[PDB]
Amino acid sequence: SRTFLVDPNLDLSIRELVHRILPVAASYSAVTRFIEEKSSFEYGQVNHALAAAMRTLVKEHLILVSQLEQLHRQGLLSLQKLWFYIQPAMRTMDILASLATSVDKGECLGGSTLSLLHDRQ
Amino acid sequence: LPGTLPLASQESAVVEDLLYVLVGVDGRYVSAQPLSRTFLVDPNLDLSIRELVHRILPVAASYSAVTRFIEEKSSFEYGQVNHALAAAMRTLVKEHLILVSQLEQLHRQGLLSLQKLWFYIQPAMRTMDILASLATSVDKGECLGGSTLSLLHDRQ
Amino acid sequence: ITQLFDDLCEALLPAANRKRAKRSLKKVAYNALFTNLFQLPARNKILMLSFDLRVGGLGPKADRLEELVEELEAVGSVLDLLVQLMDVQSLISREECLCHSMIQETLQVMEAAPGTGLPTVGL
Amino acid sequence: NLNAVRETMDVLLEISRILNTGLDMETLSICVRLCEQGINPEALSSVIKELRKATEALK
Amino acid sequence: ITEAALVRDILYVFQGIDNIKMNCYKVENLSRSLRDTAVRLSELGWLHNKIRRYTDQRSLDRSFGLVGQSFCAALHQELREYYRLLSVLHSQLQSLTLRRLLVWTYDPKIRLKTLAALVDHCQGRKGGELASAVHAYTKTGDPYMRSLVQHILSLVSHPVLSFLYRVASDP
Numbered sequence: 130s131r132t133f134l135v136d137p138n139l140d141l142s143i144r145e146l147v148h149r150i151l152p153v154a155a156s157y158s159a160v161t162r163f164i165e166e167k168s169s170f171e172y173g174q175v176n177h178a179l180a181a182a183m184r185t186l187v188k189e190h191l192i193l194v195s196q197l198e199q200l201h202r203q204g205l206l207s208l209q210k211l212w213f214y215i216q217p218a219m220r221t222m223d224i225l226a227s228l229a230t231s232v233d234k235g236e237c238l239g240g241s242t243l244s245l246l247h248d249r250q
Numbered sequence: 251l252p253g254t255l256p257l258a259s260q261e262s263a264v265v266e267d268l269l270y271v272l273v274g275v276d277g278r279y280v281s282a283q284p285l286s287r288t289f290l291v292d293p294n295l296d297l298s299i300r301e302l303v304h305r306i307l308p309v310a311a312s313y314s315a316v317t318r319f320i321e322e323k324s325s326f327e328y329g330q331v332n333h334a335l336a337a338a339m340r341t342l343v344k345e346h347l348i349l350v351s352q353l354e355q356l357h358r359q360g361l362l363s364l365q366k367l368w369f370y371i372q373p374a375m376r377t378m379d380i381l382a383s384l385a386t387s388v389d390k391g392e393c394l395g396g397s398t399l400s401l402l403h404d405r406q
Numbered sequence: 407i408t409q410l411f412d413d414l415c416e417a418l419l420p421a422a423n424r425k426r427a428k429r430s431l432k433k434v435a436y437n438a439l440f441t442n443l444f445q446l447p448a449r450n451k452i453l454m455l456s457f458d459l460r461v462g463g464l465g466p467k468a469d470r471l472e473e474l475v476e477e478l479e480a481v482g483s484v485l486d487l488l489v490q491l492m493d494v495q496s497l498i499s500r501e502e503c504l505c506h507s508m509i510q511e512t513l514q515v516m517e518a519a520p521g522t523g524l525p526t527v528g529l
Numbered sequence: 530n531l532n533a534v535r536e537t538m539d540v541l542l543e544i545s546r547i548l549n550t551g552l553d554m555e556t557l558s559i560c561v562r563l564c565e566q567g568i569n570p571e572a573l574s575s576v577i578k579e580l581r582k583a584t585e586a587l588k
Numbered sequence: 589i590t591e592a593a594l595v596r597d598i599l600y601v602f603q604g605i606d607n608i609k610m611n612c613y614k615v616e617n618l619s620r621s622l623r624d625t626a627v628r629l630s631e632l633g634w635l636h637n638k639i640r641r642y643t644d645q646r647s648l649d650r651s652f653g654l655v656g657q658s659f660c661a662a663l664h665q666e667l668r669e670y671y672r673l674l675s676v677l678h679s680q681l682q683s684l685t686l687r688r689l690l691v692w693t694y695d696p697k698i699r700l701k702t703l704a705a706l707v708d709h710c711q712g713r714k715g716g717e718l719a720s721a722v723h724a725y726t727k728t729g730d731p732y733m734r735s736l737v738q739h740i741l742s743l744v745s746h747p748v749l750s751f752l753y754r755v756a757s758d759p
Contacts, residue, residue: 275621350687406529
């Protein structure tokens with residue numbers, strides 16, 4: 130549910146494409162807040178191991194941003210080239226940002242958090 | 251306004267304008283006319299050019315009737331033969347688009363004079379003259395199926 | 407055995423004269439089969455290749471290669487024939503060589519002498 | 530038996546896939562059945578590398 | 589307006605992001621020889637919208653079924669490649685011109701012609717009735733299309749052959 134601001138004076142040929150990359154960040158700022166909260170004991174022994182197995186993917190998402198900066202130094206990273214690289218991340222961090230918002234909507238803990246993972250590449 | 255341009259230099263304007271009509275896009279001076287395509291060149295142009303322009307266009311008019319044969323005879327209601335005939339008739343159009351690309355890249359260095367153009371496209375004036383004759387003889391008498399495989403057996 | 411060499415020569419023949427090449431390739435099969443005939447355990451040769459696996463990483467794969475030859479016991483001359491024949495940074499370095507091997511394969515034709523890369527002009 | 534000789538032939542494809550041998554599934558059954566005859570495998574390593582060599586001269 | 593500037597905007601119109609604005613991409617000066625070639629090139633990007641709206645409108649509701657996913661998730665493997673081509677074309681803009689694009693993008697003017705007309709023939713079909721309306725596109729004969737659609741069928745008909753190896757049911 131995060132909102133962003135870009136620029137009053139920027140090229141329109143960029144802002145329309147910027148708004149196509151951000152939905153992987155806003156869908157990320159709601160997963161990292163699901164980990165740091167649903168790790169509290171008062172949530173059962175299921176909402177824990179769900180937050181742990183939901184953390185290894187965040188680790189692999191931090192490696193995918195590292196390999197981009199190291200590839201950015203050689204200048205081989207154009208904006209158009211970026212929109213294609215993160216596509217595996219725009220699909221995964223769109224799945225987890227939907228479970229982490231549907232497990233907290235209706236307060237689930239225990240079995241009712243193991244049912245939702247059975248109805249929901 | 252070519253009347254105020256010299257002879258040896260205005261030629262460099264036609265060759266880069268004519269290099270576009272062979273693709274299908276309209277041009278600056280040598281335009282196309284609404285619909286077997288007819289063209290219009292210029293009221294005030296050197297006669298030593300217009301007689302040679304009319305020698306290059308028959309590869310464009312013979313092209314504006316092949317690309318319209320592909321985009322139509324690809325409709326299912328024409329059989330499983332008038333399709334694969336339009337596909338194998340498309341690979342040559344691809345190789346005709348490469349021959350226009352290599353001319354523009356050779357046009358930047360100025361090495362492309364109008365007289366030099368009339369010789370480069372000769373392989374294209376013979377091929378796009380064959381296909382513009384099948385695509386007008388398969389649609390004259392409505393053929394589909396075997397009667398489109400006979401015509402390719404009677405017709406470098 | 408006179409036919410099993412004829413079916414072998416068909417598989418390695420790449421699909422499209424395909425009727426005389428098979429006759430000539432069957433010569434290369436026989437001209438090369440009798441050179442060795444004119445002129446050590448089995449599982450050990452796998453381990454010497456299992457070692458070189460673990461050194462450069464990829465341990466579990468090497469623990470798999472030994473896992474199958476242990477069940478293949480409960481044929482020995484067949485495996486003797488087979489032995490004869492940063493995770494993110496590599497991603498951004500692959501999708502960058504593609505864009506180096508895609509704009510090159512087509513600019514080498516777009517800018518050349520008129521009629522080089524074109525096959526219809528070669529007729 | 531044909532169920533057993535299918536599995537033993539299916540496992541043997543993987544060890545030829547990670548060893549980076551160009552043998553696909555068809556050429557494997559040809560070579561497995563040909564090695565099953567009793568031909569010496571030190572020679573077959575030369576015919577395949579030459580058939581693949583003369584094949585490249587065409588393309 | 590320089591020719592290079594047009595080559596800058598066209599590489600965006602191929603995606604949906606708009607000189608060239610938004611059903612034909614009417615461009616708004618420059619010479620007539622330029623506007624005409626842009627018009628046809630800009631329109632290819634418009635197609636990409638019609639195929640993107642379907643794989644975005646139906647990726648929203650959860651009542652499209654199990655076949656309607658393997659179809660809506662097989663229109664993406666045939667789009668990442670269209671995003672690889674746009675990658676290569678952008679690296680050379682730093683030389684290519686309009687007449688050089690026509691040959692580059694003459695083939696993806698067809699794949700984006702079958703897919704943008706394969707999602708309209710099967711609009712309200714869900715379940716197996718969709719796997720039966722992407723099979724009525726194989727009787728075409730064109731060796732380039734019959735070998736593309738006969739691959740999407742091999743993905744769409746995987747869920748159907750999953751129930752079978754395991755027909756309207758009544759709750």
